[PDB]
Amino acid sequence: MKDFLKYLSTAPVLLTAWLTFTAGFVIEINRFYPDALTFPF
């Protein structure tokens, strides 16, 4: 698991993981607080 972790450190895998996480928290914010046109405050 020394080269597998290095493989997971490559640009495509890291970008895919980061974009999946990013889309995930964006989608979940929009699920829990939907239809947010202005700042909540």
Where does this chain bind another protein (CB under 8 A)? 1, 3-4, 6-11, 14, 27, 30-31, 34-35, 37-41
Which residues, other chains included, contact 30 with Cβ-Cβ below 8 Å and sequence gap of 6+? 36
Kindly state the number of chain residues that form the binding site for ligand CLA, as judged by CB under 6 A: 11
Q: Left, alpha or beta for 33 (phi > 0: left; psi -120 to 50: alpha)?
A: beta
- Residue 39 token pair: 């700042």
| Of positions 9, 12, 20, 41, contacts ligand CLA by CB under 6 A | 20
Give the residues lining the site for ligand CLA (CB under 6 A).
20-21, 24-26, 28-30, 35-37
